[PDB]
Amino acid sequence: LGAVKRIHALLGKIQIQNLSVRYDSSLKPVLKHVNTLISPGQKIGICGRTGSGKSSFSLAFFRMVDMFEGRIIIDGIDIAKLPLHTLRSRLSIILQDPVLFSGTIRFNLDPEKKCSDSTLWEALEIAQLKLVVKALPGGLDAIITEGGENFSQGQRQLFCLARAFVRKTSIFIMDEATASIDMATENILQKVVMTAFADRTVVTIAHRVHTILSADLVMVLKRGAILEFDKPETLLSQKDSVFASF
Numbered sequence: 001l002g003a004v005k006r007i008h009a010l011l012g013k014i015q016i017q018n019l020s021v022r023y024d025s026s027l028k029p030v031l032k033h034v035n036t037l038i039s040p041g042q043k044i045g046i047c048g049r050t051g052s053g054k055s056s057f058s059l060a061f062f063r064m065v066d067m068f069e070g071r072i073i074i075d076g077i078d079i080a081k082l083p084l085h086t087l088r089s090r091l092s093i094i095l096q097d098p099v100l101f102s103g104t105i106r107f108n109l110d111p112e113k114k115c116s117d118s119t120l121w122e123a124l125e126i127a128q129l130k131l132v133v134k135a136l137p138g139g140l141d142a143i144i145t146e147g148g149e150n151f152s153q154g155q156r157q158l159f160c161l162a163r164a165f166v167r168k169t170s171i172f173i174m175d176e177a178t179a180s181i182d183m184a185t186e187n188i189l190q191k192v193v194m195t196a197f198a199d200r201t202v203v204t205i206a207h208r209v210h211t212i213l214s215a216d217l218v219m220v221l222k223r224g225a226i227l228e229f230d231k232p233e234t235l236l237s238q239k240d241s242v243f244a245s246f
Contacts, residue, residue, distance in 0.1 A: 012040035012170045012201045018070035021056070025068070031056050032224035033070070038217070043197045045206040047242060048221025054175075054205040061173050061203060063087055075170065092169035094160035096177040100148035105133065106140040108148065109159065112167050120166055127162035128192060129155075153177075154185045161192055171201040176211065209246040218242065 015037040022029045038044045046057045063084050072079045100108040109120050124130040132155045136142040206212045219229040220242040235242045
């Protein structure tokens with residue numbers, strides 16, 4: 001009866017306007033009066049804290065919370081008025097480290113269950129993954145045993161990128177790698193990011209200013225507010241906090 005009591009104990013245009021949010025509502029607002037606008041096809045870098053707006057940027061994109069004040073619009077519509085499951089289902093995420101299921105490669109590459117194997121494999125060709133897909137032992141039918149640990153970090157990154165491509169997202173969210181890969185592979189990865197972000201809205205969670213020197217735009221955050229946003233050369237010319245981080 002203690003065990004049953006344990007069982008009972010078991011139960012593409014984007015603009016932010018003046019958005020404030022706090023999970024606690026007590027310690028501090030997470031973001032305070034953030035304002036910026038991203039045109040379709042712009043490559044946008046978010047800089048400031050690591051995870052207060054890596055996480056606040058991602059959390060707002062995933063709609064993990066509504067704002068306390070202000071509004072967040074996606075494609076001209078306030079995110080408080082969209083079906084959350086439809087929103088998140090219509091949003092593709094490719095992070096630096098992707099978690100995969102202990103199933104087939106094809107099955108690991110289906111978070112879009114009605115995709116045909118041909119369209120997925122073709123999508124991997126478009127998203128430059130088909131070569132390493134083909135050189136997996138069973139190709140598309142290769143069981144991703146141990147949740148994807150027989151693939152490299154880079155090959156997993158490509159897989160995640162194709163997984164975004166297959167979902168035909170309007171907007172991309174990319175988690176910047178915390179380590180290096182190679183010169184030809186990080187260089188390729190950046191080329192893939194450039195092609196992905198071509199004609200599309202790109203949200204880069206930036207931490208290092210080292211990579212973001214060829215971002216179309218960098219958004220610099222301080223104490224929960226966006227104080228400045230521009231391109232890297234101009235931000236370096238500003239000589240402020242982002243220039244000190246650059």
